[PDB]
Symmetry: C3
Subunit: 529 residues, 3 copies
Amino acid sequence: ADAEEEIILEGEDTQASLNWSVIVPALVIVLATVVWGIGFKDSFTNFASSALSAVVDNLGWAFILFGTVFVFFIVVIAASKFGTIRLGRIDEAPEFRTVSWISMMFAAGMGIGLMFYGTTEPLTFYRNGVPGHDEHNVGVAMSTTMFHWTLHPWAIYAIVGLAIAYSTFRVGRKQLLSSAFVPLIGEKGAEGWLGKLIDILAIIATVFGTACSLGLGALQIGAGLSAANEDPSDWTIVGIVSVLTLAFIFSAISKGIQYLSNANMVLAALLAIFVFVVGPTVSILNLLPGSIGNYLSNFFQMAGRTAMSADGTAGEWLGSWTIFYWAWWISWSPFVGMFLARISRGRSIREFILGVLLVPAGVSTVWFSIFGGTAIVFEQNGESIWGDGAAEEQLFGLLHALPGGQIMGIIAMILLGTFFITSADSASTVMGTMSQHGQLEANKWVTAAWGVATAAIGLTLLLSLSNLQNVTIVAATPFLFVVIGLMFALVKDLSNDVIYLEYREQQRFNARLARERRVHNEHRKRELA
Amino acid sequence: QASLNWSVIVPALVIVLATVVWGIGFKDSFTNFASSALSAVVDNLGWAFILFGTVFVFFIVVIAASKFGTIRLGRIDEAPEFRTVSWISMMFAAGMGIGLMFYGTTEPLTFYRNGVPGHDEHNVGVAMSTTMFHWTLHPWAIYAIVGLAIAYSTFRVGRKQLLSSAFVPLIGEKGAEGWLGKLIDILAIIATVFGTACSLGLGALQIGAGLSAANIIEDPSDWTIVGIVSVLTLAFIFSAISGVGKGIQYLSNANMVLAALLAIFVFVVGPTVSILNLLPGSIGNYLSNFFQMAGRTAMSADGTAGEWLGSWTIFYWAWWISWSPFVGMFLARISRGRSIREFILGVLLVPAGVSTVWFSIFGGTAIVFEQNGESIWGDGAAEEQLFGLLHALPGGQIMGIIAMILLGTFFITSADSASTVMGTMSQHGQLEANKWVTAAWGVATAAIGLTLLLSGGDNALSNLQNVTIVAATPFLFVVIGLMFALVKDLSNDVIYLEY
Amino acid sequence: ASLNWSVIVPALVIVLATVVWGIGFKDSFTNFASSALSAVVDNLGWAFILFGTVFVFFIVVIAASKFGTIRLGREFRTVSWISMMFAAGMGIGLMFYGTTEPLTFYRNGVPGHDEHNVGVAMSTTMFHWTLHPWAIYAIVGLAIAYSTFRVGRKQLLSSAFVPLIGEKGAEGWLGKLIDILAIIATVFGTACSLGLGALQIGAGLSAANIIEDPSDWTIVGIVSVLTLAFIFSAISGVGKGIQYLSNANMVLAALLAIFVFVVGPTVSILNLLPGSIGNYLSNFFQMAGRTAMSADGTAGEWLGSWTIFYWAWWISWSPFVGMFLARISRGRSIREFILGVLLVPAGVSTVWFSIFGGTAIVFEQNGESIWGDGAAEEQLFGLLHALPGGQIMGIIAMILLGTFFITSADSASTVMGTMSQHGQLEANKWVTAAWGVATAAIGLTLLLSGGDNALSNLQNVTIVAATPFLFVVIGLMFALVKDLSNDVIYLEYREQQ
Ligand SMILES: OC[C@H]1O[C@H](O[C@H]2[C@H](O)[C@@H](O)[C@H](OCCCCCC3CCCCC3)O[C@@H]2CO)[C@H](O)[C@@H](O)[C@@H]1O
Ligand SMILES: [Cl-]
Ligand SMILES: [Cl-]
Ligand SMILES: [Cl-]
Ligand SMILES: [Cl-]
Ligand code: NA
């Protein structure tokens, strides 16, 4: 027994048997997407469309409904009795230091978005207005954006994060996105076909998710070069893709990820601390209460905005906006949960939440307040930043209108890169981890096999943005349910938790004990007469 | 014969008969008292129905979150007689009914076509968010109070299953049997009379305007809107005089089918995707606009919405206060041994779920019809709009015949479940009501339905509403004061003292 | 017996100057008011806005959570206690802006909203007079009352900062500075409040057919009269003076409102209770989020003379109010004290505005306006005269107006003397009458500095006076936390599992 016991400890830990049926079926869709997008660029882009108008139009309500559920659900679980439960066992304290913890996850699950949409999204919602609302409305412009980037999207991570972190550290299963479904699917099913199907959908959803954030990032680095210092031909779209395609493959191997994302303060924060002072410092402050206040005010209105909203005239806006962000963050969750779990060893199910929602929310707030704020201010001063309307161009158009803009258009260029890099190395490691049966430390070649093959989709979704968008949206549609159902696994798992049962056992006990106590003191007081 | 309090049955009868006589005999000097009182009630007591309507929702929710939420309806540490899933399935049954049939298509659409006060017209959200506001939290918060009350007094303590006993903490022991004890249980009865009879009329009128639309009867003549009732009035008796057990589940299961069937029909045939969109739209909006709706009044809209109210909000509120005695019993019965916290959340969410999807489907499909050039409005006659909706969909010719029947079945399960509850408050809290009393009440109640329905004449629903409003008005304070009894009663509970 | 000179003298140099400067250099004086006003507003407005809400959430978090159970002790009847404090914290408020505010927000609308909009005219008026302000009273009083009754330090506002500044700190230059700002803030606030009051009472005589002239020889009478009248009460201390007045003050309060409630648009006023509350909850966050950047930039000026002024004003009032709230709240639990400064004062503000603002709107609606020439200090009486028997009740309103101020003045004065003697609870009458008159004569300064410069200086000078004190009120928000966590009843509970 002793010889077969410890032999399996070093067995699964060393296990590098790359699942041939988890990797290949993914390599298939990936390279098939590349070729069906290189060789076929006429019917492929039609797939993106017809599919989108099917996903968005027939499942949009599901993103809309459950998107707001995932928020509440996890807000409950957090303030729930399951809160005190420690991810792993009570023999484990926080793995990394808190500040390094919250910083490693917020800088890992954060698409280049804040760069890309930070300046645009608010300035757009302000110029063109959003459905069911007037125009040039600061409140709605801010509240809406906030709504896209704070609690709503980040509770998605929390769910998958807690679902894996528990299924792994607390129970002891392998770090598969499918093992988190054991409470429902069973020990057998997670090793059956579904287990893979999920670990597949997870990988494919991860790919399109990263490739999108890659394409957008590329377009903006390129547009960042076009306006700052120019490449009409796709030499740099494929060249700057390489610069990054190789950059994050570095950390996937190496800690390098523990340090790369760590420096996003000298870069990102600097940019913000810069724009804060230089620009409309006061106006920005005015948008802090204006963002939180208005965000809280209009919250449910947004969760209710569907296709019938605005007298049925919003189906489009959603697809271009909200519904895209939902599906897009979803495609990221499979691997952002994987990562979030790891650094959350020993984190209570509660503290894990607040560090996943509140911190990233507070930043997303103070970020869109600066750039999206300053932008809307210039738009007001008649000193527009809009330009041609190309989001990729706007970011810098704003920076440049500020004393010391060129120097920051370079910083924000690299920052745009690193923002992707630090959140693409974690992707790869996970791409392979699932490629090798929850192999915590995947062979550095298999992860690099994905990270690069994932950028082979970026060069496709960008050379053949409504493709980087649509394809991503479609690639996440099924995995949506992988989060919706996951929201059930996490419950029928906790509810089967030892320490919780030991609590719910000593709970029933007392109602009986107390009952006896009061019933025999109702006789003492009744027999008294 | 028996000892069933005459002092509660005679004062109840006289007022029902007086209304049937003063409704039939003086069918012109009755409509006056109707609009005359309705004007006093809505003007002078509108702020009340409004202010307290929302109060009840706070009160109830505070009582679940409160440390009282752990207490369970019955002896200490008692447990449910049914499984939490069978429990739910019974409230689901309580959800669907005539009100949903009648106002399921009309109400939303109306708030679209016309828009509500303080808001623009053709507003999909607001049209739903308002509907929700009428049929979800607010209405059930009321029932949940009365229910919670009757369930505590009966199971936790051991008082008779009566509303008077619910007031013991305040009125005193001698009070439940005294004048108030009878008064309260009288108002409760007449409340249930016009409360149900209201539901009955809608059916009889809808069924009627459904025959003239199904091309069976020439027009909903004042002779047509009679044959409808009387036969369903005979249908009632048969289910009561041979054991009322057929109404609670033998018809419930029939309704659970026809209804679920019908809803699914429009759901799949009609704009399935739109209907779905109106799930987060209904809920999402209904949360955004909750308090703005809780603060709407005659002053609202620059002082120009006190009428919109008396025809909707104030009416419904009065229709809920009135039905609260009946629903309180039903709930109280199928909820013994359930914790208060678990009780409320079930009585608020399960039903809310039913209404949400239901309106989301019907109204939803109506609103989408409006949006896309194809209106079902017709003559604005809410009675016929359900069918109009139906006939606009393929096979909507047979579904219009089915709805005709589910109305009958409902007309029973409503006049049937009510007859028992009505008979119960007549016999000192007797659980199993007499086979003659219930059967008698149901018919009496229906007699009022016919009365209000015929007394108004052309679009008589006014009376139905007005009178219902006038019947509930006193019992609105009953419920309000019922909040106070519940609190002291609970603060005196042995477990909150044990803790 | 040994009044802290370093907290008094340095606190007098500032008020003994705002006079000579406001009287000697009349021009450059207001050129500072109008200047500072803009600096504070344009640059700190965001704060009053932001943290203003922090005060509501934080205080509600505390009261309902753990610490709420803590007692404020190791004295006064309860129903007298509420009036004691309500009267002490509430001044000219309901009387000066009780008719004009809803009526103004209605006619003109409010930044980012249509006009003739009842719901918002209430939501906005209610926003200013219910929770947000009274949370500013709960905090200061709390930090003090606790630092004193639960810990043992003196009632000096400074000592409530002990948990952060140190037992040595509240004795250092800050603890004094804190009790220095505490004094001055308390003074301007009552001066501004006195200016408005007397000013309104003056106009109360104009259309009263008693004194047509807004003559100084008249307002001065009313001013000094108020002074001497409340000096009687301040010196008469709690039991005999203050406690007796605050009840009488409430008595008139009802009598008036009751009158206006029956005589005026009864049902409409009732209709407004739900409408006032509902809308208030709905538009709450939107209002907490309304900033100078709201309404596309246009919201700047409005906030300047409405919201921000209010917050800033209530802050110049937190020192004495909150500090007095504490003294009369020994034994009162943390939950009983926080729900004692909010619920009832917020629930009394509500009924008030629904009866007055409601009638004022209800009038606007029937064409029978009561706006006149748009002079706040007149509309109250315009409202009354329109109601049968309003002539006599008009006089009651004038008196009650004096009362409202009086009950707030005495508490101020006494509390001031407490800050003048290292926390002497019941200081020498002569000192509580010294500040009572000292602060009083300041009222004349801002009133006799110019016509519009009354409103100009009373408003602005007050704002500045409570500009730094704002941080003081946000600092207590920390010192109070630590002072709480490290409490016996709490230390004995943290031991779980
Ligand atoms: O539904 C109609 C009801 O009113 C009728 O009388 C009404 C009718 O308008 C009308 O029948 C009556 O005057 C009509 C004169 C010719 C009818 C014969 C009358 C002779 C005197 C007694 C009443 C009937 O005046 C009454 C005014 O209310 C009759 O009483 C009945 O038909 C019924 O009660
Ligand atoms: Cl705004
Ligand atoms: Cl119990
Ligand atoms: Cl809408
Ligand atoms: Cl309104
Ligand atoms: Na006062």
